[PDB]
Symmetry: D2
Subunit: 489 residues, 4 copies
C-alpha cells in the first residue's frame, strides 16, 4: 500500500484502534491500494469522547483571542502544505489535481480563517425588564460535537465542520467517509501543530456503523452530517432518539438551472457545464436539471455540446486534466445504471453515455461527461440525484412553468437563473424553493454565505456568522435586584 | 356535559372530524364531564395541511405590518376576554382561577404582542464579495408548522408556539393535549376574528397518535413540541426520519435551586415554595432539587415549612385558593407513587405526603403540598421529574459540591441561586448547565428572554428575538455582475 | 385668522410664551392669515427643557411594552384624524390635499407604528472576557432630545424625529419651521391623549433664533435637524461647541437620476416627473439632475414633456389638483431667480418657466412645472439645489461618464438609475455616492429603510432599526468576579 | 538629539515637510532632546489627503479577507517589536518602561488584531417590502478619515483609531500630539511593511494648527479626536462647520469611584491607587473622586496611604520603577497649581504634594503621588480634571447621596463601585451617568468593550463591534421589480 497502515487520531496522537478490523482505501484512477485503515470500535469512540471532553475544557477556558490565534496558525500551515495535501486528496478521491490544488484546501482553510477572526465576536444580549431586574444571555459551547463526512470533498468538509465548532469553544470528533479516510488525519496533525489541545479535534475511522456510534453517543451534544438523504434520515432519527442532540444536515439535491430566453447564452453554457461536470459530477449543489426556454433551446444546446467536447478527460494526477474518474466502482455502477435508465425512458443521448475503458482508463472508474436532451419531469434521471456527470436538459415555454417545475421536487439544495433582466433575475430567484441561489453564476460558496437545504435537502446551515452562533447554546440569566414578591402569602 | 360537543378547527370554522372516535375531557376538581371532543383522523390532518398551505400563501403575501396589525388585534381580544378564558382554563386544567386570571392568558397574549411588534424586524443580510459580486439573504417562511401542546399551560403554550410562527409568515396546525383540548379552539376563533386568514391557525384534536400524524406529515416543515422527555425523543425521531423537519422541543427537567449560606433566607424560602408548588407543582421549570448549605439548613427549612403551612388548598374555582388539584387521575397516581418511593428510600417527610379526600376533595385529584428532607442524589424522587407538588431538600457543604451535584443530571432546563454576594451569584450561574437561570428569583419568563433546555431537556428555544429567527429559513442569493469566468475552458 | 392665536406646548398643555413677540403663518395658495403664533423666549426654552427632563424620567421608568402601547394608541389617533390633519397641513404648506391625505400623516404614523413595535427590541450585548470577568452593555436613553423641522413635510418630520426618540425612552422638544407651525401642536395633543407623560413631547415656536436656543442648550443631549446645508453647518457647529451633543442632520441634495439607453422609457419618464414635481418640487430627495443617455434622449424628453403637460395645476384645496403653489413668497423669489439664471446661462426652456398669475393664482405663490434641456454641469441650476419644480436634463454618452458626473458634487442625499439590465442596475448604484438609492423607482421611503446623506447632505440617518439604536447611549459594564490583582504591589 | 530629524510619512515613505518649521520633543525624565520634528504645512496636509484618497481606492478594492491578512501581519510585527517600541514610547512620554512594555503596544496591537478578524463581518441588511420590491443596505467606507492623538498613550491611540478605520476599508491621516510625535511614525512603517498600500496610513506632524487643518479639510469624511474638552469643542465645531464631517470624541473626565461600606477594603484600596496613579495619573478614565462611605472611611484611607507609600518612584527607564515623571513642564505646572488650590481651599494633604527635586529628579518633571482627604464637592480639585497624580477622597453617608454627588458633574467618562453585594453593585452602576463602568475593578478596556463618554466627556465610542460599524456609511438600495405606478397621471 502507498501510505501504509493508518489509524485513529485521539488525544493529540495517532492511536491504535481496538476493533481488530481494517478497511481499504484505493486510488479510483488506478485501483492502487492507498492504505489499510483501522476501524474504530465502540470502546474507541467512548475514549474519543472522554478525550474530547477533557480537551474541550482546556480549549473553552482559553480566551476567544487565544483560540483565534491558534486557528490562524492552522490556516498558515494549511496554506504552506496546500500542494502536498492536494496531492493526497487527488489520490484518495480521484478528483483532478487541478481541482484539489485550487479548491479543496484553499476553501477549507478559507472557512477556518473566517471563523478564526470571528471567534471574538460571539456575543449574548442584555435587556432590562424594569429598574430592579435585567436579563443577559451567554452563548456557551455545546461541548463535544460530532462531524460525519462525505467522500467528494473530504478535507474541505472536515474544515467546514470543525471550524465553527472549534471557534465557538467546542471539541469535535470527526469521522471521514471510509472511501476517503486519509486527509482528515492530516488536518488533525495540523490542528495539534498549531496549538489545539489534545482531544479538541479527534478522528475516528470506519463505515456507517462507526458513524452510528457517534450519533447515538450520550456524551455528544450535536451531530453535523454530510451525505445522502436516506442516511441523513437515519442519523437525525438516532441522534434525536438517543439523547436529543442538536443536528445539522446537508443532503444532496436535484437543483434546477433556469436558462431564460434573455440569458447570455455563452454565459449560460459555461455555467451549465461547470454546474454538471466539476469534480466529475460529484457535487451536491450541481445544477442537474437544466431548464432552457424554447426560443433559445437549440442555440444553448449547441454551445453546451461544444464545451463538453473540449473537456480534458484524463489521469487526475496530470495537471492538464480537468475531468477524472468517479470515486468508486459503486459510484460508477450507480451512474451507469442511471444512464441506462435515461436511454430506456426515451431521453436523447447527446454526449457521452459510457464508461471509458481504453488504455489506462480501464484501471480506473471513468464515465464520460454525459448530456441527455428532450428530458421529461417523470424520468428517473430527472427526478433522482445521480451524483455523477449526467446533465438533463428540459425545455419550457413560460417563466411560471419553469418555476413550478423547478419547485416540483422534494429536494431543495440549490437553484439558479441565467438572465440579463433585472426584474426577472430577482423575481424568479425569490420564488425558487432552495437554500442556495445563484444569479448569472454557479457554485461559489463564500465563507460569509450560509449554505444548506430546503425541504429534504437538509436541516440547518453551514458557513456565515449564523453557523458560528449555532455551535453555541443560549443560557438566559435573569438577575433580580429588588425584593422577591412572595407568590404564596 | 358543561361545554357540549367540541370538534376540529380547520379553514376558519369548526368542522366534523372523520375518525368516528371521540374522547372526553373532565374537570379534575370535581370529575364533571366538560366536553366530548372529536378526534382527528389521518385524512383530517391531511385536510388541515392543505388548508394551512392555502392560508399561509395569503398570510405571507401580506406586508409585515399587515400581519403585525392583525396579531395586535388578537392581543386586544385576548385581553378583553381574559376572565372568561381564565374560567375555561381553570375548568379544564384544575389550576386555581387566581392563576389562570393573572398568568395564563396574560402571558400568552404578552408573547403574541411582542412578536406582533417584531414582525417588521425580520431582516436578512447583505455582504459584498468583490466589486463584481455580492450576496444577500432572505428569511423566508418555513411554510406549515406543527405545534403539539401539553396540559399544564394549554392556551399559553398555544400562544407561545403560534406567535413567532405566525409573525414570521407561517401557518400552524396545533394539537392541544387531549387532557386539556378546549382553550386552543377559543384561540383559533380569536385569530379568525382578528383577521387571520382561513387555515393560518388550525386545531386538530386527539391523543398521541394524532400528534404522531403531525410529526410524520411530509407537508409540515417544522414541529414544536412541549411534553415529556420520552415522548420528545419519539417526536424528534419521527419528525427527522419522515421528512427532515426542523424541530423545537421543550421537555421538562429536575432543576436545581441552590440556597447558599449567604442567601437572604426569607427570600430563599419564598422562592423555594413558589418554585415547587405553583400550578400544583406542574411546571416544567420548577426547582425541585433544593440544595441548601449546611450552616443555614435548619433555619431555611423552618421558613419553608411555615410558608407551606399557609398554602390555601381548595377548590380552584374559589378566588381564595392558591393550590388546587392535579390535572388528572393518572397524574395523581404517578405523584403518589413517587411519594411512596421517597418514603421507602428513606427521605424524611416534612410536610404533606398524601391525597386529600375529605369533603369535596374526594371528587377531585388533590395531593397535599409535599416536602421531603434529608434527600440523597441516588433517590428516585431526586433523579426523576415528578411533575407534582414534591420538594426534595438536599444539604451540601461547599459551593463546588453544590455545583457538581446540581449538574449531575441528564436534565438541563432551569437552575437558580440565592445569594447576596455579587461574585458568587454570577460565577455559580455561569457553571450551571441549564438554559434558564435565575438569580434571587424564580419562574419569570419575559417575552424578551429565550427559554429552553440544555442536554435532554430540549432542542432550540422559545421567546426572544432569536426564536422568531428560527421560524424562517435562510435563502442565500449570490448576484454575479461581472463575467462568468469559464471553469471548463 | 382662520385658526386664531397659537402658542407653545409645554408640560402637557398649551402655554403662553414670554418673548413678547409673535409671527404670522399664511396660506400660500391665497395669502389668508392662518394664525398668529407666539415665539418662545430663552426662558421658555429653559422651561421646556425642565419639563422634558421631568417627563423623560416618568417615560423611561415605564416598561418598553408600556411605551409601545402608548405609541400604538398615538398611531390609532393619527389614522382616525388623518383627513382633518391633512386639511390643516394643506392650508399651512400649500401642498395638494391629494398629497397630504395620502402621504404626510399616513407615513408619519407609519414610522411611529414601526418604532412602537421595536421599542421592546432595544438590546445591549454580553461578552465574557475570562471565567472571572464579563462585560454587558446597556442602551440607555440620551435624555432630552431636540428636533428642528422644515416646512415641506411638517407633521411627517415631527413624527419621524419623535418616533425613535420616544420609543427609546427619550423626551423631545420640537420646533417646527416658522413657515408651518401648526400641525406640530396637533401631534403634541395626540401624544398627550395617547398617554405620553407631560413633557415628553414639547413644542416651541419661532424662527431660526429659537432653533439656535435648542442647539446651544446645555440640558439637551442630541439635536436632529432637517433643513438647508448652510443652516445645518451652523447647527452642528453650535451643538458641538456648546455641550458636545450628538447630532443627526438631513440637508437636501442635487440627486442624480440616470436614464440609460436600456431603460424602459415610459417608466423613466414617469419616474423623472414624480422625482421633480411632487410637492411642487419641494422634496429634499428629488432627482433634479436627470442624466439621459444620448441614444434615447429625444424619445425620453418627448415622454417627459407629454406627462408634464398633463400635470393638474390648481388650488391645493381641490382634490383634483396634483400640483399647487410653493410654500412662501421667499421660495417663489428664489425659484424664479434660478429660472432666470438657467435661461441666462443657456439652458433650453422646454416647459414652464414662469409664475402663474391668472385668476386665483395671482393670490398664491405658483410657479409652473419647469423643464430645462441641454444643461451643462457648470450651470448654477445644475450645481445648486433649487427646492422648486425645475428639472435639469443632461445628456451623456457612456456609463462611466454618467457616474463620474453624477458623483461630481458635494451633495450626496439620493441617487437612482433606470435600466432593464441586472448587472448595470447594481454596478451603477454601488458606484453612486449617495445614501438613498433607487432602482427603477423613486421616492419611496419605507420605515425599514435607513435614509440620510453622504458628503454635505447629512450626518447620521433616520428610519430603520439602526436609527432607534442612535437614540440611546452605550454604557459598558465590566463585572470582575475574581481577585483584583494589584497593579501597585 | 537622540533620534535626529524626524519628518512626515506620506505615500508609503518618510517625506520632507514644506513648512520650513520644526518643533522639539523631549524626554521628560531628563530634558534630553529626543528629536527635531518637521511640522506639516497646509500643502502637506493637502498632499496627505490626495495620497490617502489614492491609497483608499486600492485598499477598499481588496477583499475583506485581504485586508484582514494585512492587518494580522501588522499585529505580528507589533508583537515582534514590542520591547523596542516600548523603549521609544517610554523615552517620549516619560511613562515607566514596566508600563510601556506591558500595556501600550500590547493593547494597541490587541485592537488591530480584533478588528483584523472582524473585517469580514461587516454586513448590511436585506428586507422585503412586498413581492415586487426589496431593500438592501451596503456598509461602504467613509473614505479618508482623520485621527488626532493625545500624548498620554501615543501609539495605543494611533492603533485604536486606525484599526477600525482601516478594517472597514478607509484610509486614515493621523496627527500625533506634538508632545509625543515619534511612535506614530513607527506604526506607519509597520503598516507599510505589512502590506498596507501607500497613503492608507499617513502621518502628519505639528501642533494644534495642523490638527485644525485636518478638521477643516473638505476631503476628509470623519474626524476622531482624543484630548481635552476645550479643544474637543473647537474640533467638533470646525469639523461640522467646514464640511459636515462625522465626529468621534474622547475628552477626559472626573470619574467617581464609590467605595461602599460592604466593599472588600483591600480590593478597594488597590483599585483606588491604580485608578489614580497609573501612568503618573495621566489617564482620562482615572477615578479621581474617591467616594467612601463614612463607616469604612478611616480603614480605607489607612489602606490607601500604606499602598501609596510603597509606590516605586524613579527613572522610567528602570524596570523597577512603577511611577515616573509627568509628560511636560506645562503638565507639572498645571498639576502643582491644582495642588496649591487644594491646600488653599482646605483639603487635607495626606500624601505627596510637591515636586521631587533631589538628585536626577531635578532634571525631570516629577510630582509625588498626592492624596487629599476631607474634600468637598465645591473644591476646584474635585470639580476639575487635573490629569495628574492627585486623588481626592470624599466621605458620604448614604447610597443615594453618593450616586447624586457622583452624577453632579458635566463629565461622564467612567465610573465604578466597590461592593460585595449583588443588588447594590448593579443598581448603583445602572444609575451612574458614565459610559465606562467597572464593578470591583478599574481600568481594563477590552477590545470587545465600547468605550466613550456621556455628557461632555465625548461623542461616539471606540472599540467593540459597534465602532467598526461607525467607520462605514449606510447606503440603502431599493430595488423595484414591478411596474412603477405613475404618481402624475
Ligand atoms: N416546558 C416543558 O418542558 C414542559 C411543560 C409541560 C409538560 N412537560 C412534560 O410533559 C409531561 C406530561 O406527560 P404526559 O404523558 O401527560 O404527556 P406527553 O409528554 O406524552 O404528551 C404531550 C403531548 O404530546 C402528545 N403526544 C403523545 N405521544 C405522542 C407521540 N408519540 N407523538 C406525538 N405527539 C405525542 C400528547 O397528545 C400531548 O399533546 C410532564 O411529565 C413533563 O415532563 C414539559
Ligand atoms: N430632508 C432634507 O434634507 C430636507 C427636507 C426639507 C428641506 N430641506 C432644506 O431646507 C431648505 C429650506 O430653507 P429655509 O431657509 O426656508 O430654512 P432653514 O434651512 O434655514 O431652516 C430649517 C429649520 O431650521 C431653523 N433654523 C434656521 N436658522 C437656524 C439656526 N441658526 N439654528 C437653528 N435652527 C435654525 C428654522 O427656523 C427651521 O425650523 C431647502 O432649501 C432644503 O435644502 C432639507
Amino acid at each position: 500500500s502507498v501510505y501504509g497502515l493508518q489509524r485513529l487520531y485521539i488525544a493529540g496522537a495517532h492511536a491504535d484502534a481496538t476493533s481488530g478490523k481494517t478497511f481499504d482505501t484505493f486510488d479510483p484512477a488506478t485501483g492502487e491500494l492507498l492504505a489499510r485503515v483501522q476501524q474504530a470500535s465502540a470502546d474507541d469512540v467512548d475514549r474519543a469522547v472522554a478525550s474530547a471532553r477533557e480537551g474541550q475544557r482546556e480549549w473553552a477556558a482559553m480566551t476567544a483571542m487565544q483560540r483565534s490565534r491558534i486557528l490562524r496558525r492552522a490556516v498558515e500551515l494549511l496554506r504552506e502544505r496546500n500542494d502536498a495535501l492536494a496531492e493526497l486528496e487527488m489520490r484518495d478521491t480521484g478528483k483532478p489535481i487541478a481541482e484539489t490544488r485550487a479548491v479543496d484546501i484553499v476553501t477549507g482553510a478559507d472557512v477556518i480563517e473566517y471563523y478564526a477572526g470571528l471567534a471574538t465576536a460571539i456575543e449574548g444580549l442584555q435587556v432590562p425588564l424594569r429598574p430592579e431586574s435585567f436579563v443577559y444571555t451567554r452563548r456557551e459551547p455545546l461541548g463535544v460535537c460530532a462531524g460525519i463526512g462525505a467522500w467528494n470533498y473530504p478535507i474541505q468538509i472536515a474544515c467546514w465542520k470543525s471550524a465553527p465548532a472549534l471557534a465557538a469553544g467546542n471539541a469535535m470528533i470527526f469521522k471521514p467517509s471510509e472511501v476517503t479516510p486519509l486527509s482528515a488525519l492530516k488536518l488533525a496533525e495540523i490542528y495539534t501543530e498549531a496549538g489545539v489541545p489534545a482531544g479538541v479535534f479527534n478522528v475516528v475511522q470506519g463505515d456507517g456503523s462507526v458513524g452510528a456510534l457517534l450519533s447515538a453517543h450520550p456524551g455528544i451534544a450535536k451531530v453535523s452530517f454530510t451525505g445522502g438523504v436516506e442516511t441523513g434520515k437515519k442519523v437525525m432519527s438516532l441522534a434525536g432518539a438517543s439523547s436529543l442532540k442538536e443536528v445539522t444536515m446537508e443532503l444532496g439535491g436535484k437543483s434546477p438551472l433556469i436558462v431564460f430566453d434573455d440569458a447570455d447564452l455563452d454565459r449560460a453554457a459555461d455555467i451549465a457545464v461547470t454546474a454538471n461536470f466539476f469534480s466529475a459530477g460529484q457535487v451536491c449543489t450541481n445544477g442537474t436539471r437544466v431548464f432552457v426556454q424554447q426560443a433559445v433551446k437549440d442555440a444553448f444546446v449547441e454551445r453546451v455540446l461544444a464545451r463538453v467536447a473540449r473537456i480534458r478527460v484524463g489521469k487526475p494526477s496530470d495537471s492538464d486534466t480537468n475531468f477524472g474518474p468517479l470515486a468508486s466502482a459503486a459510484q460508477l455502477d450507480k451512474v451507469l445504471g442511471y444512464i441506462d435508465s435515461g436511454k430506456a425512458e426515451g431521453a436523447k443521448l447527446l454526449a457521452g453515455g459510457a464508461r471509458l475503458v481504453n488504455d489506462h482508463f480501464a484501471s480506473g472508474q471513468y464515465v464520460a461527461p454525459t448530456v441527455f436532451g428532450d428530458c421529461r419531469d417523470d424520468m428517473r434521471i430527472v427526478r433522482e440525484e445521480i451524483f455523477g456527470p449526467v446533465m438533463s436538459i428540459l425545455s419550457f415555454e413560460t417563466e411560471d412553468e419553469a418555476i413550478a417545475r423547478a419547485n416540483a421536487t422534494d429536494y431543495g439544495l440549490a437553484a439558479g437563473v441565467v438572465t440579463e433582466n433585472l426584474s426577472r433575475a430577482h423575481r424568479a430567484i425569490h420564488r425558487l424553493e432552495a437554500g442556495i441561489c445563484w444569479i448569472n453564476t454557479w457554485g461559489e460558496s463564500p465563507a460569509e454565505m450560509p449554505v444548506g437545504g430546503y425541504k429534504q435537502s437538509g436541516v440547518g446551515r453551514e458557513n456565515g456568522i449564523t453557523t458560528l452562533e449555532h455551535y453555541t447554546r443560549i443560557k438566559s440569566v435573569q438577575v433580580e435586584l429588588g425584593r422577591y414578591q412572595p407568590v404564596f402569602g
